[PDB]
Structures are given as structure tokens and as C-alpha cells.
Amino acid sequence: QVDSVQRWMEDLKLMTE
């Protein structure tokens, strides 16, 4: 996995609008 992509995905899991 690419670490920056992993981090983005971890944040994304909590993201809604």
C-alpha cells in the first residue's frame, strides 16, 4: 500500500457532506 493513500483512506472513512 502507499502510505499517503492509506492515510487519505483512513480520513475518507469518516468523511461525509
Place this chain on the structure above:
Amino acid sequence: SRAAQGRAFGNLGNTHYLLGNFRDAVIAHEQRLLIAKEFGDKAAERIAYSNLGNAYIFLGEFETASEYYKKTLLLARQLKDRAVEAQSCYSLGNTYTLLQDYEKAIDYHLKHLAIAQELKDRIGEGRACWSLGNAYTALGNHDQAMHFAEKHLEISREV
């Protein structure tokens, strides 16, 4: 009321998403999207594209996610929403990395970088430098990678 149903679908989609129900999030957000188009509600249409893209990432459907993020990007530009334009560019850069399309990843990461600098979003700038350094290294472009690795280090100390 069709407008109330649109609100209800947008709420259901978000709750399914946060519960990890990504399929059911898509089903609900699609109906939010349709109703937003019926009513000419561009805010809701944009939001639905972004939430759909996110759900498709967690379904492993990266090409589909990229299609929805490109739609969000178009609408964010029409709406003159720079922070949302930046967010959709960052999501596209990551999505193209997942698709191993580093040229498109770099394109959208450079777009995000520029907007994060304009908005004085220093944390976002750091993310951009992280991501760009990684992409340039994947391609062997070590002079570009050096620039962004230095900038990531500098920012990492501030925020």
C-alpha cells in the same frame, strides 16, 4: 414531498456510509443525486457526487470513483468553491494512484497543491508534498521528488 425525500436520501446515504454499508450508501446517494437534478439544486448535486466517489473507493471500484470525482470537480469549479475543488483534486490524485496511473495522479496532485497554497492550507500543502514526492519516486523522477520531500519535511515541523 419529493424535496423531503431528497433530504432523507442524503441523510440515509451518509449514515450507511459511516456504518460501512457502502453499497446501500450508493443506492441512497443516487436517489439524492437524481432529486437534486430534478430541483436544480447544485449544492446537493455536488455533494452527492463526492459522497458517491467516496463510497466507490471503499467498494474497490476506483475507475467509477474517478468518474464521480471528475463530476464533483466540474461542479466545484462552476460553483467557484475553491476548497471543494482542492478536495476533489486530492481525491483524484489518490484514486489515480490506486489505479497505478501516476501521470494522472501527478496532474491532480499538482492542481490540489496550487489551491492549498492559495488557501493557506498548510496541512493540505504538506499532504500534497507527501503525495507528490511518493509519485515522483515511483516514476524515478528524483529531482522532482527531492523538491517535494524537502517541502514535506519543512511542513511536517510546522503542522
